[PDB]
Structure formats: C-alpha cells, structure tokens
From a paper:
We previously reported that Elizabethkingia anophelis, a bacterial species of the phylum Bacteroidota and a commensal of the malarial mosquito midgut produces a 2-component CDC-like (CDCL) set of proteins, encoded by adjacent genes: one large (CDCLL) and one smaller component (CDCLS). The studies herein show that, unlike their CDC relatives, the CDCLs require proteolytic activation of two distinct components that then interact and form a pore to kill bacteria using a mechanism only described for the mammalian complement membrane attack complex (MAC). The receptor for EaCDCLL or BfCDCLL is currently unknown; however, the CDCLL is the essential membrane-binding component, which recruits many CDCLS to form the β-barrel pore. This type of mechanism is only used by the complement MAC wherein a single C5b8 membrane complex recruits many C9 components to form its β-barrel pore.
Residue numbers in the entry: 33 to 70, 89 to 377
C-alpha cells in the first residue's frame, strides 16, 4: 500500500563529523570478513546506522520499538507477535546460524550461549581494543559516538544546557573503544513482514516500528576528556592508555600520559564492565584503567554484552539511520 520511514537528521555544532583517528583490531576485522563472506561519510554529513546500547534490558535481536522513542531512552515496545527469526553469528573464525522462536532478551541469551559453545576459535584472542578518536568543543558532539540523538547531559549526569554545552578547559577529546566478540545479524523476514499476523503491520501505523536486526556483543567504552594540555598531548596520552601492555593487573602506561589523564576531567560510559549487565558511568582515570585492565577473553559464560545494534523499519525492512550534519 505504502511504506513510510522516519530517519532522523541531526545538526551538530561541530566543524567535522568524522573521527580524527581510528584503529581497527584483528578480531573486529575478521568479524566483518565473516559477515561479508557469508552510507555518506564526509566531514560535513555522516550517516549512522550503529546505535550504542543505552537500555540493555530492551536491546535484543528481534525486539520491536517505536523509533521516535529511542533517543530519550523510553523504547516504547510494539508487542504484536513475531514470526520466528533466523540469526547468524559472525565470529572472527566461524559463522553459526540459529533460529529464535520468540524473540526476547532471555531467548537471545540462550542462543548466544549455544553459539559460543559451538563456535570454532582460532589462535589466541589479542585483547586489543578498537578505538575511534575525535576532538570536540561541545558536549552534544558526543552524539556521534553514540550513533544517535541521545541526551548526553542525562547519560553523564552533567548540566550542558545553554552555555554549559561548551567545554571549560582548553582541549576536549572523546573516543569510542571496543573489544568485539561477535555480531548477530537477523535474516530478512521470510514473508517480508516480521509480524506473525501480517495484518498487525497495519496496526503499527503511526508507531514508527523498527526492529533490532543486528546486535554486536563485547565490551565498549565512550570516554570524554577535558584537559588544559594540547590536543596532541591528550591524544597521545589516550592512545597510550588504550594500547598499553597489561602486566600482573597493572596498566603499563608511560608516566607522563598517566599524569595527563589523571589531571584531566575524565568520564567514561561503559557497557560490559565486569560484574554487571547495566551501563555504568565512571569518573576518573582509575576507573578507565580498571576497565581496560579487566577486558579479558570471551567465553560462553562471559561473552560480553550487547554493546551496539542496528534497527530496521518494519514497513519495508530498510535500515534505520541517523544523518548527522554540521552548522
Ligand atoms: Ca509475517
Ligand atoms: Na601504542
């Protein structure tokens, strides 16, 4: 009859939307190999189809939400029954397929455990973090790292309304850094309509339904640094932390870089920290260091958590995205 999609366009007060620098780890490269074997990206316009997890209990493959309710963390569900889904797990060294009869958080967890147990693993996990680094001046620019128009002030419990959106120190740097275990991808619906009773699609008119069609597991951080050191000094120090050796539980970072980060105003949004399924926001280098140091091997019992996801429109199965623009 007709397919309507709503894909947000968000203007940011940045001069550039693309990361200044980035590093891709072997494991993340190999996962994409497995995905492929089996977008506008300019400084002034950037399409984002990856959304960092903000509501862990609702972020499971096959979940269906009103797309206009994601940015404020409401995630209003659309609860009509779904057809069973077919999902593929792309690992660094394997590709595993499963069927989930009734998409739910518990069903995803059970499927993940089964896939982790079945998967072939080759060589040793390197534990290197991927990282993506960008200078910033306004806290709203961190929406880039989250991949969507989230409320940065509420996530980080900071007042950035009005003139407080601007950093107070000389230099601002943020980064997104990840250790990826695997990516789950949902097959397109067999009959073109995710709903078990296809006529329920028409009942979702006006509810802007999107379904979670890809979920990546691992651990993730988004760090914000405000410092009176220079961009090059902060950026070097940040990379030194992210790439430092870990010896008997100690981050073997050079002393000057540690001092820069300790002296800075440093917050990290963490998904997949040890012990918790919740997201955490920490302040200070010590908590950042602890997260890096304890980022260990993935196992079936400790597979990480959902760290980011993609969604698709139920009307036509196209990918849901945010377009970021400058000015
Ligand atoms: Ca159907
Ligand atoms: Na390094």
């Amino acid at each position: 009859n007709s397919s309507k999609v709503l894909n947000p366009n968000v203007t940011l007060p940045a001069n550039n939307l693309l990361y200044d620098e980035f590093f891709v780890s072997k494991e993340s490269k190999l996962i994409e190999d497995s995905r492929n074997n089996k977008l506008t990206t300019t400084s002034s316009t950037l399409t984002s189809d990856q959304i960092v997890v903000t509501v862990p209990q609702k972020t499971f493959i096959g979940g269906v939400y009103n797309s206009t309710t994601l940015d404020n963390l409401d995630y209003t569900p659309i609860s009509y029954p779904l057809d069973p889904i077919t999902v593929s797990y792309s690992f660094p060294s394997d590709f595993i397929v499963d069927t989930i009869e009734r998409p739910s958080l518990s069903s995803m967890r059970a499927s993940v455990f089964k896939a982790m147990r079945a998967a072939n693993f080759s060589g040793e996990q390197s534990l290197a973090f991927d990282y993506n680094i960008k200078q910033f001046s306004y806290y709203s620019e961190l929406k880039i790292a989250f991949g969507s128009n989230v409320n940065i002030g509420k996530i980080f419990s900071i007042d950035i309304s009005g003139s407080n959106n601007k950093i107070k120190r000389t230099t601002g740097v943020f980064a997104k850094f990840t250790q990826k275990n695997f990516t789950i991808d949902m097959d397109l619906p067999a009959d073109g309509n995710i709903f078990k009773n296809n006529s329920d699609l028409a009942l979702t008119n006006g509810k802007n339904p999107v379904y979670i069609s890809s979920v990546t597991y691992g651990r993730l951080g988004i760090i914000s640094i405000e410092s009176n050191a220079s961009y090059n000094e902060v950026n070097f120090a940040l990379k030194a932390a992210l790439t430092a050796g870990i010896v008997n539980g100690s981050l073997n970072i050079d002393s000057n870089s540690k001092k820069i980060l300790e002296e800075s105003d440093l917050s990290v949004y963490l998904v997949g920290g040890r012990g918790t399924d919740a997201v955490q926001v920490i302040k200070g280098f010590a908590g950042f260091s602890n997260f890096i140091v304890n980022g260990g091997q993935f196992t079936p019992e400790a597979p990480g958590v959902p760290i980011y996801f993609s969604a698709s429109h139920a009307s036509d199965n196209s990918v849901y995205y945010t377009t970021f623009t400058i000015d």
